[PDB]
Amino acid sequence: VGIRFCQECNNMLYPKEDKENRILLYACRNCDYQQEADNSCIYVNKITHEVDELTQIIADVSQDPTLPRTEDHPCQKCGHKEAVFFQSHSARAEDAMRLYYVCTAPHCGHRWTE
């Protein structure tokens, strides 16, 4: 799923097929450096696009003076009783009125939806 760079000329390693041992070989076009593939899959295309933005929001958003705050929902990892919540603010806005939270305690940065 990732990418492979050549170890000699630092370029993009293409996948190739050899008719001897039935194993995927990654080859270079400039040089002909070789090696075998460990996962033996090339292409993947996610159309659902249901990526949870809990992996994209940053912990320093709790320094924003223009975001609402809450005393109801406390943090689990530290027990702080003050959070700051917001919406998806991104694409995939068909049914996007969820409410992600971020703890505001210094050096906690814990994030969670509900």
């Binding site: 996948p15 097929e17 039935r22 194993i23 995927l24 593939a37 996962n39 033996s40 899959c41 090339i42 292409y43 993947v44 295309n45 996610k46 159309i47 659902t48």
Partner: protein, 176 residues
């Protein structure tokens, strides 16, 4: 705009004044003849039967794997159904293509149009040729996957870029 979408007023007038080919929202109103005009279910079935539906609307994700042998089954759990096909092995005519294409489907978007991968399976074959070959699961299994390989008669221009071209071509030119 204060009133879905309809054009009225003076712009609709000069759309009538001239007969310019481009109405800003062409729309044909349709009426229904049989009890289908009465019950909502037949209305909805003819609704789905009239609307255009492509492939990328009924797929979840696709992946190009590499099975040099159909018994290799790089992904862990698809071995069961591909094997119960494999004890009934047909079409090993020229070779077996080491390049595989795996497609995952969303039963939500599948059933809403009253589709299941049987009709898809024949028409993705009947309509494109026979250069492709589709084996599939049973829908009792929760996730609906069907795997495709090129017809090995071609192996006796790279097949990887060709398979990516075909993958990027079928999801938009499906015509379900």
């Amino acid at each position: 705009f204060h009133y879905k979408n309809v054009t009225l007023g003076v712009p609709r007038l000069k759309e009538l004044i001239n007969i310019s080919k481009k109405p800003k929202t062409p729309s044909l109103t349709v009426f229904l003849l049989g009890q289908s005009a009465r019950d909502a279910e037949r209305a909805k079935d003819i609704l789905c039967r009239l609307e255009h539906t492509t492939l990328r609307k009924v797929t979840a994700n696709t992946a190009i794997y590499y099975d040099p042998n159909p018994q290799s089954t790089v992904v862990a759990e698809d071995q069961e159904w591909v094997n119960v096909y494999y004890e009934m092995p047909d079409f090993d005519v020229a070779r077996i293509s080491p390049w595989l294409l795996r497609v995952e489907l969303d039963r939500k978007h599948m059933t809403d149009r009253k589709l299941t991968m049987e009709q898809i399976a024949e028409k993705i074959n009947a309509g494109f040729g026979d250069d492709l070959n589709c084996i599939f699961n049973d829908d009792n299994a929760e996730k609906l996957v069907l795997r495709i390989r090129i017809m090995n008669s071609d192996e006796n221009m790279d097949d990887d870029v060709f398979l990516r071209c075909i993958e990027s071509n079928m999801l938009t030119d499906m015509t379900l």
